[PDB]
Amino acid sequence: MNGAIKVGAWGGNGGSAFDMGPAYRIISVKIFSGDVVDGVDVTFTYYGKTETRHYGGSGGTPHEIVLQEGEYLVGMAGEVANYTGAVVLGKLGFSTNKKAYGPFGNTGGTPFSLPIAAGKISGFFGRGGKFLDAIGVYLEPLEH
Amino acid sequence: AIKVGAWGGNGGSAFDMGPAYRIISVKIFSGDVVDGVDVTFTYYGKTETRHYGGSGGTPHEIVLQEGEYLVGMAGEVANYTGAVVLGKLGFSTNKKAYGPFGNTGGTPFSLPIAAGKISGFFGRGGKFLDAIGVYLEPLE
Ligand SMILES: OC[C@H]1O[C@H](O[C@H]2[C@@H](O)[C@H](O)[C@@H](CO)O[C@@H]2O)[C@@H](O)[C@@H](O)[C@@H]1O
Ligand SMILES: OC[C@H]1O[C@H](O[C@H]2[C@@H](O)[C@H](O)[C@@H](CO)O[C@@H]2O)[C@@H](O)[C@@H](O)[C@@H]1O
Ligand SMILES: OC[C@H]1O[C@H](O[C@H]2[C@@H](O)[C@H](O)[C@@H](CO)O[C@@H]2O)[C@@H](O)[C@@H](O)[C@@H]1O
Ligand SMILES: OC[C@H]1O[C@H](O)[C@@H](O)[C@@H](O)[C@@H]1O
């Protein structure tokens, strides 16, 4: 709605769908991983309020991406893996205009990659259960 | 503008179609790998056809009817003749999926578009289709 662009999700069809929408300012992403990507905390601000939403399960070790002023997400990549009979994110990483993060997770499968020649990530959607079944992103231009 | 990709290598020369008002058809030229593409589209009242990459292989045309649009692109980035190029390429419309076109396996990529459409292309081309990316636009 209202001109959104959503690409993905990459991953499986298990778990429950989630959708943050494109209206919030992402300030940090915490990826929980071990053998696979267990889940993600997305922290954002909106009208001066800070909120965190958790997607996926409770396992794994956290890895944080804390955006600095003028830093934005410009890429996402990883691997879709078969794990415990589920199709989930085995690995997940991100690029900002400042550096590369991850990938986090230790199970390979089918790679995916989202290089963004022009634009940036403005929100997330996907599916979560015990692990992070799938992830996709909202996009918006770098400026205008 | 929203430009995602390109997927592929760093050889050949850069190309950039820019966005179209409507894509009418795409022809994927392929053999062992993806040789190139034709794109026929409307633009500020005009109908145009552009060719990117080489013209070896055989063309595979996808014609889009009005109300039909491109909602996915996928393929494999392969190593061929000492170059990194598109080994396979396919597209999905809101009606059906087409492809793969090309026969050389490599690193897969996929671009499902949950909301939006492909409105144009950019990338690199030489003898073959070294790299390809897309312009995205929201649905009307
Ligand atoms: O997030 C992955 C997966 O987690 C949960 O399922 C687990 C287990 O109960 C299932 O038997 C297997 C195979 O489906 O997968 C996991 O180990 C569920 O939340 C499931 O919906 C979800 O896909
Ligand atoms: O990311 C999934 C899961 O990975 C790790 O656990 C694995 C292994 O190290 C454990 O020994 C066995 C126990 O049966 O479970 C997995 O195969 C941990 O990092 C875990 O927290 C995480 O959820
Ligand atoms: O589009 C692929 C490739 O095409 C042309 O190069 C061909 C040949 O002349 C080269 O020897 C090998 C190795 O680079 O690749 C092709 O077979 C050039 O236009 C090149 O830049 C481009 O990558
Ligand atoms: O796809 C690369 C190459 O593969 C084969 O050799 C033929 O189909 C050619 O016409 C084509 O150019």
Side-chain angles (χ1 to χ4, degrees), chain A residues 75-93:
Chain A
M76 185 174 73
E79 303 262 347
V80 175
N82 290 312
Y83 183 80
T84 72
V87 175
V88 300
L89 289 159
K91 301 190 180 177
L92 179 67

Side-chain angles (χ1 to χ4, degrees), chain A residues 3-10 110-111 113-118 125 139-141, chain B residues 1-7 107-115 122 136-138:
Chain A
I5 290 173
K6 295 166 73 179
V7 296
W10 290 276
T110 304
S113 55
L114 183 70
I116 308 166
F125 67 97
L139 299 178
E140 76 166 51
Chain B
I2 304 291
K3 296 172 70 177
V4 297
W7 292 272
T107 305
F109 72 92
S110 54
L111 181 79
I113 304 159
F122 67 95
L136 299 177
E137 280 186 21

Side-chain angles (χ1 to χ4, degrees), chain A residues 24-48:
Chain A
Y24 309 137
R25 180 185 180 172
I26 296 156
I27 62 164
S28 65
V29 173
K30 187 178 285 175
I31 298 165
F32 296 84
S33 65
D35 286 354
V36 298
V37 179
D38 291 83
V40 185
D41 283 347
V42 180
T43 301
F44 59 85
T45 62
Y46 190 56
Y47 283 89

